[PDB]
Design a protein around this ligand. Sequence first.
Ligand code: CIP
Ligand code: CA
Ligand code: CA
Ligand code: CA
Length: 513
Amino acid sequence: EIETFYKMLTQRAEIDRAFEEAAGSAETLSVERLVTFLQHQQREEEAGPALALSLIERYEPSETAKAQRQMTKDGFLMYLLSADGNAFSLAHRRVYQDMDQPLSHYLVSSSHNTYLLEDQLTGPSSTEAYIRALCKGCRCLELDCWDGPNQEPIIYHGYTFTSKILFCDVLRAIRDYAFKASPYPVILSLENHCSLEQQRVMARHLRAILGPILLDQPLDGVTTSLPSPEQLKGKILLKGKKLKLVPELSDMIIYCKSVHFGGFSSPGTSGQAFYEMASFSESRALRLLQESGNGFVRHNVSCLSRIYPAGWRTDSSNYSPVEMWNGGCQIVALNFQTPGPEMDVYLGCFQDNGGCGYVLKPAFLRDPNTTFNSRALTQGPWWRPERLRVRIISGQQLPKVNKNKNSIVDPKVIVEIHGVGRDTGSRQTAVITNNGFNPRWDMEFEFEVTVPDLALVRFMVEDYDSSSKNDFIGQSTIPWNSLKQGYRHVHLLSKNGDQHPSATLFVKISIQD
Ligand SMILES: O=P1(O)C[C@@H]2[C@H](O)[C@@H](O)[C@H](O)[C@@H](O)[C@@H]2O1
Ligand SMILES: [Ca+2]
Ligand SMILES: [Ca+2]
Ligand SMILES: [Ca+2]
């Protein structure tokens, strides 16, 4: 029975079935019978004996089967639970994109009022908040500088009761973590409310603390465009007002001068210099996208636009980033402290390209002459309908979302499509009652996605509550082009972005044009 049990508790039919079909009669998968699976099922492009063999070498537990170039059901499952079996493309989990274009061509991971740990009104500020963001790959941070006691500038949310911290303390932390998660440039957005004296102090600290990391001179060459992530690699650039403002500071603003939004230079030649960055509240941006979608887009090709949360979000809530990315907006600032679908999608997007924090925009969003407008879709390269079929097969060890008691989860799965408005959709499965160890739904959904290049597929698992609002159990957001096909496992994350060791969803994905 001790056999039966570990052999029972640990026993997945869907897995068995999958092995069967692949292996057929055999009790094993031969390199050829693995290749066809890799091609027919997993749709690997690099399908071939080479891959198969590495899979077997990497995952096969049986020394006999290994040595004999075969895969057992055990190795089959291990492959399926590995980084290679992940629905989130392993290949995309390393920098693999063109890092040589001007900054304006990349979506950049950006945070809003980075110093804040909670609400915008009375919650605390901390260097920790900066460390956290940086550790999540954030590239563009915010510093709200105000004069402090003893000629030491402080950082906090002006005009509120949020707790304070030292500008210098913040600089050390940024210094210490700026590149822990990526080698690409960090941008510091300074909102400067300092007296000229304390501004001088700021400049002193910047130089003193950042030293060589700090970029304080234009890049030789770099004449008509913003440098590239590659060119700025290992650097930290300041973004702010450039000559009420001491030269010491103004002189350090090189590639990102804060400017008031002029408008878009289509009816002319020039508008904002590539080294000029405009900011838009969530609200204004929406409006501009609503009326000037293509203008904004075209603007965003050579120019970096920063977007920030609406003033009413004193709770540090977040808006949807997708809507801004659809306009090619690059520095879409969110409140990194706040868990929710928005940050889920945010970090899902940025888990791409090895999480270096810079993700190359689609080509049509890099064409100054594009006619694209996610709002008014016409024919163009962006238009490329695909049919996605996702089968939510089963769940493994869904985490017990507290309950402050001994209950059993009643899980259900929601699958969502995020992208151009036309494509957004959501579907949900039934609820399996009292089972988190191995609920089985075996439900399939199909979605039509017309602009996959801007889409993300999100899997969310909730604990169905009849009386209350359903608890969130886990989630995973995968950018369209990183979505792997065939049988895969979706590795669920907690609301804080943390990896849930053994919580997975087993699915079968198929994308067809
Ligand atoms: O704490 P904040 O200054 C950060 C945020 C923006 O990024 C600024 O562009 C804007 O002007 C402020 O109103 C907003 O509150
Ligand atoms: Ca601010
Ligand atoms: Ca229950
Ligand atoms: Ca429930």
